[PDB]
Write an enzyme that holds these catalytic residues in place. Sequence first.
Site, PDB file in Angstrom:
ATOM      1  CE1 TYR A 155      45.284  33.280  35.256  1.00 49.93           C
ATOM      2  CE2 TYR A 155      43.464  33.565  33.858  1.00 49.93           C
ATOM      3  CZ  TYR A 155      44.085  34.024  34.718  1.00 49.93           C
ATOM      4  OH  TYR A 155      43.563  34.996  35.610  1.00 49.93           O
TER       5      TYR A 155
ATOM      6  CB  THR B 271      39.859  34.373  36.112  1.00 50.19           C
ATOM      7  OG1 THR B 271      39.933  34.923  34.969  1.00 50.19           O
ATOM      8  CG2 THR B 271      40.352  32.938  36.103  1.00 50.19           C
TER       9      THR B 271
HETATM   10  N1  LIG Z   1      43.850  41.598  35.387  1.00 47.33           N
HETATM   11  C1  LIG Z   1      42.668  40.802  35.293  1.00 47.33           C
HETATM   12  O1  LIG Z   1      41.784  41.484  34.366  1.00 47.33           O
HETATM   13  C2  LIG Z   1      41.989  39.869  35.890  1.00 47.33           C
HETATM   14  C3  LIG Z   1      40.883  39.345  35.635  1.00 47.33           C
HETATM   15  C4  LIG Z   1      40.355  38.417  36.422  1.00 47.33           C
HETATM   16  C5  LIG Z   1      41.166  37.559  37.341  1.00 47.33           C
HETATM   17  N2  LIG Z   1      42.438  38.431  37.837  1.00 47.33           N
HETATM   18  C6  LIG Z   1      43.295  37.934  38.880  1.00 47.33           C
HETATM   19  O2  LIG Z   1      43.543  39.051  39.697  1.00 47.33           O
HETATM   20  C7  LIG Z   1      44.893  38.793  40.080  1.00 47.33           C
HETATM   21  C8  LIG Z   1      45.641  39.804  40.037  1.00 47.33           C
HETATM   22  O3  LIG Z   1      45.900  40.022  38.430  1.00 47.33           O
HETATM   23  P1  LIG Z   1      46.584  41.152  37.941  1.00 47.33           P
HETATM   24  O4  LIG Z   1      46.255  41.570  36.625  1.00 47.33           O
HETATM   25  O5  LIG Z   1      46.857  42.102  39.019  1.00 47.33           O
HETATM   26  O6  LIG Z   1      48.124  40.273  37.720  1.00 47.33           O
HETATM   27  P2  LIG Z   1      49.557  40.945  38.011  1.00 47.33           P
HETATM   28  O7  LIG Z   1      50.460  39.954  37.336  1.00 47.33           O
HETATM   29  O8  LIG Z   1      49.639  42.515  37.800  1.00 47.33           O
HETATM   30  O9  LIG Z   1      49.629  40.695  39.659  1.00 47.33           O
HETATM   31  C9  LIG Z   1      49.743  39.387  40.544  1.00 47.33           C
HETATM   32  C10 LIG Z   1      51.078  39.636  41.252  1.00 47.33           C
HETATM   33  O10 LIG Z   1      51.460  38.352  41.929  1.00 47.33           O
HETATM   34  C11 LIG Z   1      52.801  38.143  42.126  1.00 47.33           C
HETATM   35  N3  LIG Z   1      52.854  36.763  42.600  1.00 47.33           N
HETATM   36  C12 LIG Z   1      52.813  35.732  41.573  1.00 47.33           C
HETATM   37  N4  LIG Z   1      53.241  34.731  42.169  1.00 47.33           N
HETATM   38  C13 LIG Z   1      53.799  35.034  43.509  1.00 47.33           C
HETATM   39  C14 LIG Z   1      54.378  34.242  44.269  1.00 47.33           C
HETATM   40  N5  LIG Z   1      54.500  32.787  44.782  1.00 47.33           N
HETATM   41  N6  LIG Z   1      54.483  34.899  45.411  1.00 47.33           N
HETATM   42  C15 LIG Z   1      54.448  36.233  45.520  1.00 47.33           C
HETATM   43  N7  LIG Z   1      53.949  37.093  44.609  1.00 47.33           N
HETATM   44  C16 LIG Z   1      53.633  36.462  43.688  1.00 47.33           C
HETATM   45  C17 LIG Z   1      53.409  38.810  41.028  1.00 47.33           C
HETATM   46  O11 LIG Z   1      54.592  39.019  41.142  1.00 47.33           O
HETATM   47  C18 LIG Z   1      52.569  40.111  40.651  1.00 47.33           C
HETATM   48  O12 LIG Z   1      52.840  41.202  40.790  1.00 47.33           O
HETATM   49  C19 LIG Z   1      45.166  37.532  39.787  1.00 47.33           C
HETATM   50  O13 LIG Z   1      45.008  36.109  40.590  1.00 47.33           O
HETATM   51  C20 LIG Z   1      44.439  37.065  38.375  1.00 47.33           C
HETATM   52  O14 LIG Z   1      44.489  35.744  38.157  1.00 47.33           O
HETATM   53  C21 LIG Z   1      42.931  39.482  36.897  1.00 47.33           C
HETATM   54  O1  LIG Z   2      45.061  37.680  32.202  1.00 49.28           O
HETATM   55  C1  LIG Z   2      43.956  37.694  32.970  1.00 49.28           C
HETATM   56  O2  LIG Z   2      44.270  38.131  34.179  1.00 49.28           O
HETATM   57  C2  LIG Z   2      42.430  37.756  32.246  1.00 49.28           C
HETATM   58  O3  LIG Z   2      42.275  36.997  31.142  1.00 49.28           O
HETATM   59  C3  LIG Z   2      41.140  36.950  30.569  1.00 49.28           C
HETATM   60  O4  LIG Z   2      40.950  38.162  29.927  1.00 49.28           O
HETATM   61  P1  LIG Z   2      41.163  38.579  28.587  1.00 49.28           P
HETATM   62  O5  LIG Z   2      40.296  38.469  27.712  1.00 49.28           O
HETATM   63  O6  LIG Z   2      42.517  37.806  28.209  1.00 49.28           O
HETATM   64  O7  LIG Z   2      41.804  39.960  28.548  1.00 49.28           O
HETATM   65  P2  LIG Z   2      42.662  41.109  27.452  1.00 49.28           P
HETATM   66  O8  LIG Z   2      44.028  40.549  27.616  1.00 49.28           O
HETATM   67  O9  LIG Z   2      42.164  42.510  27.625  1.00 49.28           O
HETATM   68  O10 LIG Z   2      41.998  40.456  26.184  1.00 49.28           O
HETATM   69  C4  LIG Z   2      40.741  40.772  25.750  1.00 49.28           C
HETATM   70  C5  LIG Z   2      40.471  40.306  24.341  1.00 49.28           C
HETATM   71  O11 LIG Z   2      41.317  41.173  23.431  1.00 49.28           O
HETATM   72  C6  LIG Z   2      42.047  40.312  22.795  1.00 49.28           C
HETATM   73  N1  LIG Z   2      43.348  41.061  22.297  1.00 49.28           N
HETATM   74  C7  LIG Z   2      44.159  40.887  23.386  1.00 49.28           C
HETATM   75  C8  LIG Z   2      45.527  41.779  23.052  1.00 49.28           C
HETATM   76  C9  LIG Z   2      45.816  42.215  21.909  1.00 49.28           C
HETATM   77  O12 LIG Z   2      46.647  42.722  21.325  1.00 49.28           O
HETATM   78  N2  LIG Z   2      44.808  42.061  20.905  1.00 49.28           N
HETATM   79  C10 LIG Z   2      43.508  41.721  20.999  1.00 49.28           C
HETATM   80  O13 LIG Z   2      42.645  41.744  20.164  1.00 49.28           O
HETATM   81  C11 LIG Z   2      42.178  38.933  23.169  1.00 49.28           C
HETATM   82  O14 LIG Z   2      42.349  38.097  22.316  1.00 49.28           O
HETATM   83  C12 LIG Z   2      40.738  39.135  24.124  1.00 49.28           C
HETATM   84  O15 LIG Z   2      39.889  38.504  22.835  1.00 49.28           O
HETATM   85  C13 LIG Z   2      40.121  36.727  31.793  1.00 49.28           C
HETATM   86  O16 LIG Z   2      38.869  36.882  30.724  1.00 49.28           O
HETATM   87  C14 LIG Z   2      40.147  37.783  32.789  1.00 49.28           C
HETATM   88  O17 LIG Z   2      39.018  37.371  33.480  1.00 49.28           O
HETATM   89  C15 LIG Z   2      41.377  37.533  33.405  1.00 49.28           C
HETATM   90  O18 LIG Z   2      41.564  35.902  33.865  1.00 49.28           O
END
Ligand SMILES: NC(=O)c1ccc[n+]([C@@H]2O[C@H](COP(=O)([O-])OP(=O)(O)OC[C@H]3O[C@@H](n4cnc5c(N)ncnc54)[C@H](O)[C@@H]3O)[C@@H](O)[C@H]2O)c1
Ligand SMILES: O=C(O)[C@H]1O[C@H](OP(=O)(O)OP(=O)(O)OC[C@H]2O[C@@H](n3ccc(=O)[nH]c3=O)[C@H](O)[C@@H]2O)[C@H](O)[C@@H](O)[C@H]1O
Lengths: 315, 314
Positions: free
Chosen positions: A149, A126
């Site tokens: 986190y 992330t």
């Molecule tokens: N969504 C974003 O913007 C974002 C940005 C940066 C990094 N990431 C990373 O991308 C990855 C996916 O994020 P996401 O948004 O899809 O989250 P998500 O919560 O939708 O998906 C993660 C999945 O991992 C599963 N999981 C967690 N712990 C587990 C375990 N012990 N065994 C099996 N399954 C397990 C959960 O059940 C879940 O469905 C994460 O590693 C997150 O940190 C996401």
């Molecule tokens: O969880 C994750 O996997 C991600 O966490 C971080 O993403 P974020 O920026 O948290 O995403 P996002 O929920 O879209 O909030 C965006 C902005 O909107 C603001 N925000 C959010 C919600 C809301 O209701 N209102 C608001 O202003 C909020 O306060 C923030 O300033 C990392 O950057 C990402 O790489 C990954 O780790």
Amino acid sequence: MKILVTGAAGFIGSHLCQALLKNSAYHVVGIDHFIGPTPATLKTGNIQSLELNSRFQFIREDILNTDLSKLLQDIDVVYHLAAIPGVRTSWGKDFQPYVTNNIMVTQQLLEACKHIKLDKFIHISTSSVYGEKSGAVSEDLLPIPLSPYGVTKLSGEHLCHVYHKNFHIPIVILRYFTVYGPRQRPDMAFHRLIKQMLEDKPLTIFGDGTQTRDFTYIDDCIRGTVAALETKKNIIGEVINIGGKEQASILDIISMLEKISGKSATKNFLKSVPGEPKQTWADISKASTLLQYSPTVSLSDGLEAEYDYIKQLYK
Amino acid sequence: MKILVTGAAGFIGSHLCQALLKNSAYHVVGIDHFIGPTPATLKTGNIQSLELNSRFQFIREDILNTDLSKLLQDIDVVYHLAAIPGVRTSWGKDFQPYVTNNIMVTQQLLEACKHIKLDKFIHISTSSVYGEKSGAVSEDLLPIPLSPYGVTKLSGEHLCHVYHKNFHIPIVILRYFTVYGPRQRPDMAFHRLIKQMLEDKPLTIFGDGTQTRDFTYIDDCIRGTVAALETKKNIIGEVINIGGKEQASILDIISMLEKISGKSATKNFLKSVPGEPKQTWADISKASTLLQYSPTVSLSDGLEAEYDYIKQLY
Ligand SMILES: NC(=O)c1ccc[n+]([C@@H]2O[C@H](COP(=O)([O-])OP(=O)(O)OC[C@H]3O[C@@H](n4cnc5c(N)ncnc54)[C@H](O)[C@@H]3O)[C@@H](O)[C@H]2O)c1
Ligand SMILES: O=C(O)[C@H]1O[C@H](OP(=O)(O)OP(=O)(O)OC[C@H]2O[C@@H](n3ccc(=O)[nH]c3=O)[C@H](O)[C@@H]2O)[C@H](O)[C@@H](O)[C@H]1O
Ligand SMILES: NC(=O)c1ccc[n+]([C@@H]2O[C@H](COP(=O)([O-])OP(=O)(O)OC[C@H]3O[C@@H](n4cnc5c(N)ncnc54)[C@H](O)[C@@H]3O)[C@@H](O)[C@H]2O)c1
Ligand SMILES: O=C(O)[C@H]1O[C@H](OP(=O)(O)OP(=O)(O)OC[C@H]2O[C@@H](n3ccc(=O)[nH]c3=O)[C@H](O)[C@@H]2O)[C@H](O)[C@@H](O)[C@H]1O
């Protein structure tokens, strides 16, 4: 090629499995036991649809409860996406699951990978590892997370380097920046804001809305992620930022959503939340060099898609 | 001033409490759960001895199973030393306690310190956060640990920065480099090699023994650690290396032990342990400026003090 996708029922994992299975050569094993912020009710459909594909198998189990020797014996590539995400909910009594699922899970997977000969162990991290920086961040910067986190995700990257250096596990680390699009988790900003806009409810803005992110459209994210498997370049040991086409503020996004929806949104400005940087901005030059990555989806196109997905989800 | 020392019954913690109690103005509360690599029966004497001091209170409890709001009520300074230490035993299933006691304990303490008004939260960390570097390492170098132990200690450092930036907890991070002397844990090199020499057992060398460390004598470490409390300089948010008077290889130390004992060592060369750097060497420029830190105890003097301690202990 046989590919293990951890967190396969999540936002990014479900899209990644769908993309891999488009290549008839790929077989995919998804493992997920439906925890973290998205309720299971939103995940089962995508898994049932993937299970129709003869080259997809699903395991509904916690990685920590799984026989990883059995799971990994025929695996060529691991995409490790399983985690507890969410910058804002990683405080106090909520922290323990981030440690167990972001640190202990990663250690157990890497230990199990000592006993096989993977092609690649592709670890998803992330932008939250960086914390507050000025300018576009490159992958050599000293990371100082602002959230618990981010700390746990950074410990996961460090474990990858420990196992690469000591045991030659072929790690690659991808740092995603704020991914959005269809299937985006319900705790994320765009999902919340679009849902509030469709419901004629005040939009919840944390702080003044001028915070910016390098928002990454899900199809861009997945093209970079697949490129980590398919590139001809040697990328083992590399950390690679995967970021979006266009950086924007939350106020900018709300204006774009107003133009898409024809709604005039009420704003509810709430106290800023600890743990969140004012800005994220990826330098994606390394991904260009190593992966031929180039994000192509504009915010207006990506927000149209997410708007239509949310409108249908709550219809 | 009232000071909380976590890990007060341990090697470094027991010495710190002893040093602080010499100041008639300081009141000390020690907390220790008697876990990690040192048997409880080697630790209970130090607690009973510290407990002769009316200004010392001991709490035998797990920080994770303690009322921390009650523990911290009257506390001005925290010294956080409680951890599970040891590079070599941090692999495989043995990792789990490192995560609990190095990461969850640190988070729970910082959470408890949020709304109390500490003067300082002095967090003890390790050279093991750096992994392999040539020349003296400074605190601005990007740390990439070589061991799981190192990962968990760097995670605790990063928690300190999170709580400092979001809640203004006044953290100071000290990175110790291989501490030795009286009360050194029985799993560390000097304690093992001395005990072996005393028992006329073979000396266990991991690898070829040409690895070097920046060995820090316990009294030098403690002078630096007390300086973190007493310095007139603003050191809030700083990471500070604490290193020793001289570097030496394990083969160098064995030569010195042969001279102290007058015995010839049978060397048992064992396989290298993954996760260990070939060399550690602190750049103590920052400690020199901020803490007036200068290590003074020679390795010869310090190793003799440890040798006498081990001989009396057993
Ligand atoms: N969504 C974003 O913007 C974002 C940005 C940066 C990094 N990431 C990373 O991308 C990855 C996916 O994020 P996401 O948004 O899809 O989250 P998500 O919560 O939708 O998906 C993660 C999945 O991992 C599963 N999981 C967690 N712990 C587990 C375990 N012990 N065994 C099996 N399954 C397990 C959960 O059940 C879940 O469905 C994460 O590693 C997150 O940190 C996401
Ligand atoms: O969880 C994750 O996997 C991600 O966490 C971080 O993403 P974020 O920026 O948290 O995403 P996002 O929920 O879209 O909030 C965006 C902005 O909107 C603001 N925000 C959010 C919600 C809301 O209701 N209102 C608001 O202003 C909020 O306060 C923030 O300033 C990392 O950057 C990402 O790489 C990954 O780790
Ligand atoms: N000895 C060294 O060379 C050295 C060098 C660098 C860093 N350090 C760090 O210095 C500190 C002290 O190391 P040490 O050699 O004195 O180790 P030690 O094991 O002798 O002392 C640590 C103490 O912490 C206590 N403790 C651990 N988890 C606890 C918990 N949950 N609740 C209560 N008490 C708990 C243990 O019972 C133990 O007595 C550690 O943080 C270690 O990482 C040590
Ligand atoms: O855990 C800790 O608190 C420490 O972990 C790290 O210390 P170390 O160098 O591991 O200490 P130390 O046990 O004296 O091993 C010295 C050498 O002797 C070798 N060694 C050891 C034992 C033995 O029988 N034979 C041997 O050759 C052994 O292989 C190694 O090469 C950090 O640097 C320290 O800051 C602290 O965190």
